[PDB]
């Protein structure tokens, strides 16, 4: 079936090339540029990685004024937002330099959109207006995550009425990205398994669907997972090769981007359940995917055979489902991850509660598979 399929986002790839920051700002600012540096918190991290200093040397080298503001936290407030506006405004800022991760980024593109406008910013996070222009914003991207570097939304939370939500429209997409492997170096091993994880789960959630006549788009989709599962691995055992950490960045962009993902319905069911394990006990992400993920497949493999049979065929050479299962949980376990949630502590006690609470409102929640409450609660028994 149909698709539309638009990203804005310049690419630069690579390492070696921080030229890049101020020839890019130059490209796409009104003429004088005058940025605003945005990071999180006081910059330690960013400062004592040394990529504060090159950015700094980089807006040197093209004579760029730059003012700083710090002080980003990791669910990003929409208070810092506000400040920043006005600091645009008050100072004629003509393009945003975002330092940091997905908490900087999404910071800087409510800013870049409020800078821009007479009213209230948060309109555009309520539904009140649609934004039709952004001041423009750059990313340097130090950590990788979610993709919010190339995506069109920005998440925020207004902590004095304690709300969180979304702005999702084309003018949030960074002018442009700059994505360098090295920044992987230095991530500890616990969170690059969790995120060589997220990036198969997030092409995992796009792949098993009931759409039809997906043939290409299926193939690059197992292309990409096949390079994580291959290359995760040898990634974990040599953390600072460079081929290794391009191969995964690059696949994570593949995946975010998600050209390779258009005309397919995606089903959130792992997602939503993860969602609730994370909410009441301290698990990082990409660990609980790999717990639930294969659980959920095990519990609705009887939905459409032929696409878990291509799957193992095609990912991981085999077109037996129980033994293709088995060798992705044996991928896990070589990223250092234990498999079982009993393995961190987490009884079965909150399992009727995370079900419940994944379901809200409704009676089922899933695509591929419409799962209701003991089914969740099955899927979680598989986990245990």
């Keep these: 079936d149909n698709f539309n399929y638009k990203n804005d986002t310049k690419i630069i790839f690579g390492k070696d090339n921080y030229s ?15 940025i605003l540096l945005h990071y999180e918190a006081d910059g330690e991290l ?7 200093e090159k950015v700094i040397s980089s807006l040197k080298e093209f004579d760029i004024e730059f003012i700083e503001l710090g002080g980003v ?7 810092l937002v506000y400040e920043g506006i006005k600091i645009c405004k008050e100072e004629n800022i003509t393009f945003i330099l975002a330092v940091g991760g997905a908490s900087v980024i999404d910071s800087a593109k409510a800013i870049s959109l409020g800078a821009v406008d007479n009213g209230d910013v948060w309109d555009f996070f309520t539904a009140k207006r649609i934004p039709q222009d952004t001041l423009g914003i750059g990313v340097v991207l130090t950590i990788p995550g979610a993709g919010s570097e190339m995506s069109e939304s920005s998440i925020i ?14 003018v949030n997409f ?29 092409l995992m959630e796009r792949y098993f669907t009931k759409s039809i006549d997906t043939a290409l788009s299926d193939s690059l989709i197992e292309a990409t997972m096949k390079i994580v599962i291959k290359y995760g691995p040898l990634l974990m055992k040599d953390r600072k090769n460079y081929n290794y950490c391009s191969q995964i960045m690059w696949a994570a962009t593949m995946a975010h981007n998600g050209m390779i993902a258009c005309g397919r319905v995606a089903d959130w069911a792992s997602h939503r359940i993860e969602h609730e394990i994370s909410g009441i006990y301290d698990l990082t992400h990409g660990i609980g995917m790999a717990i639930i993920f294969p659980a959920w497949m095990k519990y609705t493999k009887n939905i459409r055979p032929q696409i878990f049979e291509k799957f193992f065929k095609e990912v991981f050479n085999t077109v037996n489902i129980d033994e293709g299962i088995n060798k992705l949980e044996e991928f896990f376990k070589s990223l250092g991850i234990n498999l ?11 399992f009727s509660l995370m079900a419940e609470k994944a379901l809200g409102n409704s009676e089922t929640l899933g695509r591929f598979m419409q799962l209701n409450k003991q089914d969740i609660i099955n899927i979680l028994n598989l986990a245990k």
């Design 174 to 202: 960074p002018k442009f990205a700059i994505l360098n492997p090295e920044v992987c170096y230095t991530i500890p091993d616990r969170l690059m398994a969790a995120g060589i994880v997220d990036i198969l789960s997030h």
């Design 20 to 34: 890049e920051i101020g020839k890019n700002i130059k490209i796409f600012s009104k003429k004088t540029p005058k």
């Design 73 to 79: 936290v990791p669910n990003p407030r929409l208070s």
């Design 46 to 52: 960013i400062k004592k990685l040394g990529i504060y």
């Design 340 to 350: 079982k949630l009993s393995d961190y502590g987490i009884t079965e006690e909150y």
């Design 157 to 170: 939370t207004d902590e004095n009425k304690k709300q969180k939500a979304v702005c999702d429209t084309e």
